[PDB]
Design a protein around this ligand. Structure first.
Ligand SMILES: [NH3+]CCc1ccccc1
Ligand SMILES: [Ca+2]
Length: 222
């Protein structure tokens, strides 16, 4: 996260770290048995780490649980990184407490201008900000016109831009798969962009609200 601030410990209890010998992507807990992330973060098996603030230090609030199923969206495509969403089933249910709590799925699609929060353990491009400690940032959703103008012909029905055209504040490498929360609901998943925090190149996110039918039908299986 570039241009943000350190989150108050455990203020984003749905945030998770995906690990395969080291941290490589983020994710969000949506209920006791399922996690939502990005299709581009796919691996056949991964370890999900919940209840974290500093990923390099044992705090006593953590839960480490292996996956039993990793499901990428059936229509994912690398040409334009379309349909960048994935579901992960936990091998045993998570214990909900002061440190671990799920985030609600969308009751609507958020309109342009809405302020949201994005978080993660990715690159900070700062000499004072420690990426080992969870970082937070507030960003506004941009209009379709401004999003398409920045990336001509590359924006599909499953994407939205959020951030600042002036540059300076944005999500970055390592934040992939993480949450974008607006009005208390999960509206986006960190997906792609050209560089990080560059003027004229805002971040692009997967649009969760249009995937509701696939998400609910898929979770109805155990
Ligand atoms: N806002 C850009 C986020 C991003 C950048 C590079 C790789 C993956 C995700
Ligand atoms: Ca820790």
């Amino acid at each position: 996260i570039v241009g943000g601030y350190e989150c108050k410990p455990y203020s984003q209890p749905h945030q998770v770290s995906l690990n395969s010998g080291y941290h490589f992507c983020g994710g969000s807990l949506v209920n006791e048995n399922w996690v939502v992330s990005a299709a581009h973060c796919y691996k056949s098996r991964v370890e999900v780490r919940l209840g974290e603030h500093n990923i390099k230090v044992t705090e006593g609030s953590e839960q480490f649980i292996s996956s039993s199923r990793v499901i990428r969206h059936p229509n994912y495509s690398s040409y334009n990184i379309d349909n960048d969403i994935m579901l992960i089933k936990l091998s045993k249910p998570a214990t909900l407490n002061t440190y671990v709590q799920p985030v609600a799925l969308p009751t609507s699609c958020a309109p342009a201008g809405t302020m949201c929060t994005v978080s993660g353990w990715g690159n900070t491009m700062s000499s004072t900000a420690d990426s080992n400690k969870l970082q937070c940032l507030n960003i506004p959703i941009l209009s379709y016109s401004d999003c398409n103008n920045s990336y001509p012909g590359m924006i599909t029905n499953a994407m939205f831009c959020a951030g600042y055209l002036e540059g300076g504040k944005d999500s970055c490498q390592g934040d992939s798969g993480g949450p974008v929360v607006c009005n208390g609901e999960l509206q986006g998943v960190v997906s792609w962009g050209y560089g990080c925090a560059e003027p004229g190149n805002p971040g692009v996110y997967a649009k969760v609200c249009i995937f509701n039918d696939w998400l609910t039908s898929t979770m109805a299986s155990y």
